[model samples]
Target: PTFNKITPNLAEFAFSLYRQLAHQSNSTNILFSPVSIAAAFAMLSLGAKGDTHDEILEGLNFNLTEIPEAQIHEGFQELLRTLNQPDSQLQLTTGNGLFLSEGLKLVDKFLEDVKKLYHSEAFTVNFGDTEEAKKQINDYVEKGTQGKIVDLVKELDRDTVFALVNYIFFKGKWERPFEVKDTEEEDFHVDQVTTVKVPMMKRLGMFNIQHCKKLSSWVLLMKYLGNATAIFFLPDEGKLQHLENELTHDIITKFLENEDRRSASLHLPKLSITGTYDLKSVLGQLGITKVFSNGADLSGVTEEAPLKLSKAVHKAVLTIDEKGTEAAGAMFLEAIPMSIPPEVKFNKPFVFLIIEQNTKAPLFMGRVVNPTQK
Candidate 1:
């Protein structure tokens, strides 16, 4: 469970999820928690047997041959512990729950493991009362996120044996706060021919940043109140595609490791975005197809009526205001030179990620092409 192994695996999964999501979203402002989604799958993986287990592991880009199965779960447990720790400077909470039909019976072992290892609780609801069931799950998510997200489950089928829910919320002040008065409307280039007006914020001071020759992007570490950070990536104008093509675990790791700190003028937007995703299709595209079909082997969970995953939905809300970045959990951050007015201007389309500095685990990842649109 050393970070050396977990870090790379997390990065690889983040990028893989990003690629699948970006392609499906059609480039319209995208945001989601790779860690949260992956954790949900990993928790589900514990009860999966045979090919069911292997597909999830392989889809998450975790090589069992390299890292033992026990180690992977241990890594997630440790990572969860690190993330769930209370921080005076940062506010964060990760939640997991299972909403099962009142008649459904779960294996005691599976329930015990989920509660002990992942801190998830199981609740019984009458699926026949679809409205009440949806409200219960959605309310749990809303409360967990402090009303930032609601209606996580808009509708549930009457025959649905169970539904798994995961929620994450975070709020942290900036180490150096940005002045609210400095924010003003400006033009954001959505593409070569399109532009939109957005409220952009400014901050001028010493910061860690670097110009990576490999991806042709400016990487910066934007620190939050505590040790939390958001690593921003701004590919040279018109190079977003090229940079994305080069994104990988090793490359991002090296870029973050090889950073230099210096003074810079920063121009960033006041970001407030809400994104919802239907993940069943995306997971299938990533080779986790078995769990969605009748041939699934989720016998580890229950033997009642051939239980299989019916839906995988994720919703996230991220706000970057003067105080700091407040985002839904399971979820960046640096350098520049001395002179020449070094700047990490986030004026156009760009990418960014929120990660724990210690474990190097990504909590949330997103890209904004038009801040005004989202």
Candidate 2:
């Protein structure tokens, strides 16, 4: 039941989903919580029967032969427990909610399993009242994300019998906090011919950085106050497309393992980013089509009506600023008079991953095409 077994699978799925989203819009910002999507589907699998069950798990890159169905849910349970540790320094929270049609009779076992394994809460709402149902779900998400994400559910179909929601909210301070005084207006190149001004924060300190020759990118790792780390990948000018195509789980692991500690002047944008996805079409492209179709066998949920997943929406929000909750200072290495530290500037498009250090889980993955854009 240790969650380590699922960590790599989760990461692989993150890359796969990232590529899909990245390819969708080459010029716009891309952000999404892979764990949130995976966890929601994993929870849904509790009610899925036969092929519907297997497809959900397989879509997450979990091999049932290597790891049984029971262990997968157990892994998530342990993983969620680790993430929601009350004493952690970082403010990171994630949870799930199941809003069902009023008077729908769900199987007792499925309800018990979701509550136990996914820490999910089940609610009965009258889907016939679309506005009220939307408000109810939006209020839940807004509260879950601590007001960062409001109006997540803009509209809901009246025929929606079951709506599953998952959300992640994270607030962390830099280990070496960026000084407010050092922030300045800088030009960010959005494309070959366009540029926009952004408030870029600067910090000079010892950091773990690596130059991946294979991908023609520089990988920088910045630690949060707690167990999380923010990894930034800056590709050479006009090389982002190559980097995107070459990125993989093994390369990410290698970059993490082989980074060298050196003093560098880092310039990062102070901005907020949000990603919204209609997972119905995205998951369909990932070979999870049965759940949304009439062939879905959700007998475990309820036999009252022919139940099938109607809509799956995932939304995540992230913000970066010049503050950390706990007061932390910087570390200085011995001065070398003859050498110049490499200047790492994210003035162009780049990729990033916010990872949990202990479990090596990719909590969120995104690309900043333009910091000024949401």
Candidate 3:
């Protein structure tokens, strides 16, 4: 399936964008949906022409020479189809939108392609009426994420010919949920000098955990009831830089393969984090410059007026707690041993990736410097 073909490319771009975000701001929390950003650009490439078109695909880590341009869109079509399949146990939904200025007609082919391949909706808004346009876009996103994200469009450029938006919302119940009674307000060391109290949930169960000597970090794999897993990386004291510098898609794949499943006590903070980014600047740094400039050839979109991408915005929200947004059979296994198991507490700065198991697509990636902030 074309879905499998895009997984590696998705991961490569995910980490590449993450590293740039991490480098840009070292002290703040990092959280964003790589899939959402990638899909937005992939859809935009439909309207792009010449170097602008190639730059969007290539900047997404896609080698056009190896894979035909048509295959890339096909891959995304397969990806979105599989991800949106009905699953009673998981609440995972993603969508895209194109808000165009009133009377600015897009090429029929571009509009049809976005709707069919990207599952995107097109709306005409009077950009001159900035406040109302903002409300319309914000309302759409707010509903898409089930109210998790509100006011995504705080401001919109009046000259924006079109504003592209994408959002992904996931709420999965844990296979083994932590008991709320065990949650306690504990000190979370934000850094060498700062500490904040957060409600940390605790659980003791069989878990897939490992210590990688190469990255100098402890990796924990927590499964949701559905076909998804959240991998948390806790670096050794003062080793976050080392782990971040050396982490890659291959390293994560190897760690998952070599994971040791054993009993352990886990403590995780209740996560309520949100990431808002202006992707124009970020994408520019990644060598995707042509689309945003006046020398752009978006002839595929419309020849009526010169259209250059003026603004690109993405926002993602994630919430993790004792019970997921929602269940299950509990089988008695072996008796507990007399010796105490190792305690793996996430009380410091760490990185996390929530991935869809089948495609290995990173649904969300972020670092928690201070969970209490969001």
Candidate 4:
């Protein structure tokens, strides 16, 4: 299915995370990279978006999300009431006048509730300039990574300020835990176009693999837990262009439209990644051009001039091993993973897309394969 098939709560949650990303970036004319959006969709399938609401997410992300500011506040309040042991985190802000003032009030209320309802260790932030924004983002990366992403958020600006309100959460376990003893040094393609050596995570086991000569690449998919999965696509030398052009939404849907699923033994290494992206072209190619225009219906934002989505810059690093999924969920992984499983080491860098299960619109998307050079 297309993005139209997605749920609203997933859209709101993904949009929230997207807003948080805005809090870190300095630009607004840019939209999110494909990779970043994909992860948002992935979390939605995992129930991180709260499990209610229908598809038609673009409208949900647009006009509808603002209308619920009060309800969101009460909805959040009610959610808290039902949980005895809860790890719910809330932060909200926006440009929609409909809920702007009230949203501000809710922000204050949220802070108060966070202070009162959750324990001191549940959340933290400074809420001022880029300095504070960086602090907040780094804090999130650090938590998702158990502190490995100690300084992930370095600077913040208008774009990043919006990304700040967009939220995120991850919950998964390795199907087969890695053994520290099996770890070894290996070369990995940081960007598939150009191979590089990074100390890669190595594990040996039977893996499911497919070489799509049609795309001149191999696909390896792995499961985290329940229905969540990570798909790594490694293109052969000189074939990235072919893969890019052939990957239409329908083609992707066909790839993951599975009936008889089987288990595959896989060996993937602990891989670490870092990428910086300029996503202007990809989003336009994907039919989201209106986001860059004033005509762009984001009247929800107060100062649309400064609230522009400038440029979406995404960065991520992941290490999967015996402990757990030490990962960073960025917009770079936004849409388009069919939740397919993988096999083999993630030796070559590839595009990553995280999407919700119900509707296939990408929460975000991007290529670790290449980011514009500084």
Cα lDDT of model 3 by residue, 12-71, tens digit: 787777667665767778777778778777776675556766888887777789788667
Per-residue CA lDDT of model 4 for 1-374, tens digit only, reads 12332233433433444434434443121223232333322212122112212231232342335444334333333333432132222111101001011112122222222233322122223334556655555554444445433443355554322342122223334444445565566665542355455445543343434556556666654444333334556677634556644553444454555433333333444533333333334333333444333433222223222322332333343433454444532223223223344444555555544443423334333344322322
Candidate 3 TM-score, C-alpha based: 0.91
TM-scores for every predicted model = 0.89, 0.91, 0.91, 0.47
Please report, as a residue range, the 10-residue window in candidate 2 with the lowest summed lDDT.
Answer: 330-339
Tell me the tens digit of each residue's lDDT in model 1 across 1-374: 54788767787777787776766655577777767777887776676657766787777787678677777888887887765566657765566677777775567545555556566676777888889988888887877787788767887888676777767666546765655676757777766887677778876656667677877888777677777767888888767876666777677677566546667777777767676666675677877788756675555555465776655566577777766444622112223234455656666888778777666767777777765564
lDDT of each: 0.70, 0.71, 0.71, 0.37
lDDT string for model 2 (1-374, tens) is 34446877888777767667655666667777767778777776775557867887787777778788766777777777766666546666766677778886666555665666445676788899898888888777877777788676778887777777767777657676666787877888866787778678876656677677877887777777777867888888767767667865777776666647776776777777786667764578866787666675565566577766766677788878855544335434424322245667778778788877666777787877765554
Overlapping backbone residue pairs in candidate 1 total: 20
Query: Which segments of model 2 are wrong by more than 4 Å?
Result: 1-4, 325-341, 372-374
TM-score-better candidate, 3 vs 4:
3
